[PDB]
From a paper:
We selected the ICH system because it diffracts x-rays to atomic resolution at ambient temperature, has clearly visible diffuse features in ambient temperature x-ray diffraction datasets, and displays large concerted motion of an α-helix that is modulated by the chemical state of the active site nucleophile.
As expected based on these structural and space group changes, G150T ICH superimposes onto WT and G150A ICH with a larger Cα RMSD of ∼0.8 Å. In general, the CCLLM values are higher and σ values are lower for the Refmac5 anisotropic ADP models compared to those refined in PHENIX. Considered together, the improved anisotropic ADP CCLLM, the lack of change in CCBragg, the lower values of σ, and the more typical distribution of anisotropies for the Refmac5-refined and rescaled PHENIX anisotropic ADP models show that diffuse scattering data favor anisotropic ADP models that possess more plausible features even when the Bragg models have similar Rfree/Rwork and CCBragg values.
Author numbering:
A (entry chain A), B (entry chain A): 2 to 227
Write the structure that this text describes.
Amino acid sequence: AVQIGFLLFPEVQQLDLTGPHDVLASLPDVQVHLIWKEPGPVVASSGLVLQATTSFADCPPLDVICIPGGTGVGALMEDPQALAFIRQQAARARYVTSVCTGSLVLGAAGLLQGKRATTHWAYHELLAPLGAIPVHERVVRDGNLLTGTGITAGIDFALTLAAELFDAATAQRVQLQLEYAPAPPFNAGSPDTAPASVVQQARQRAADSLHKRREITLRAAARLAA
Amino acid sequence: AVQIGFLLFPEVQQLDLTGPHDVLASLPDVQVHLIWKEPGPVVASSGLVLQATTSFADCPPLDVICIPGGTGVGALMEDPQALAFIRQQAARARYVTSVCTGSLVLGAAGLLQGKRATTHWAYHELLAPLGAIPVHERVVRDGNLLTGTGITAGIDFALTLAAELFDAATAQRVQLQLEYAPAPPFNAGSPDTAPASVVQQARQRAADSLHKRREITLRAAARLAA
């Protein structure tokens, strides 16, 4: 059975996790884990309550690890227990993946040093100090590392993982079973396509968070320099 | 504050709910409810554990009600307490919405009689016996009723609801904040675009479920005929 694990942390952006979870849980011979320090309730940034299924110590060796993003990323970038767990699992995993600001956690763990990667558009400047080669593309692969942008990046790259772990026909079957064919009613999902006025509103609303994450990123980078 | 409610039931397809939940919970002056018979744990079809926040009796009058789909729809189509709650809320709601097989629950409640509607492709034949005018389109509006197909239909129609409840700039801002710009790596999300071999595999895997839901649908239709 393929072992797939998601890190589930307080103030996660739950859709970053719940999207790929439902797709990958549709596959035969897959066991999916929601990992935190102990099993039990974890509250997402919206207030949605999720349940972690396993502790760090009890988690099996994973074939796929996925780090979601969210508000809670800032704390996770300076959580030595979480970072050590991610490094341990990444050593032997077939795929190391992240959604949105989850790539900043991979960066804090030292797993982006010399690697091409992306993250959420408003935080993209934080990749270079963590040793990454920043790339402005929605899905960036570098060896066994996949980083994706967008709250639903994990749905799309879950279909890629299904095709590689199984075969294309299996991925196509899951897509059809889920009738997955998105058609957004607006075209404002990138700072390159949204109106300039909207980009300004979004940048101003992210400014306090970016300021705090500049400070955290520099401390995380200092630990990597040691 | 706009009151938005999702029905949360055992064996729900959780992404049908968790997608629109995260989008709508991003909006100012919105309270989102997860409704079941009592607050507490509800297990999705994948095994993911969610928590209902309110009972039927305690739920405020809703501006938006959303019925997700999933395995668990069959039981809900013959749950008189759930159907009565949906009818009560639909009477005064500004929007009555469903994702995937959630429209079969609206059908069992009598809310599709004479209305254009869609549902999951494998179950589409069950709409006509529930009094609907079946339409093969991904999002179908008829007055205040929106029915959508695809596990992520609710993400897309949540942006439409945001634009109508607030304004287009608000919907565009939420889309940009979430960097929502899907790009599936396969084109098999419709029986019209998937390979014929894949459509056969998917139809054969749905056959037992369809057979059971034919039986349930006929009993539900008999109750509407009374």
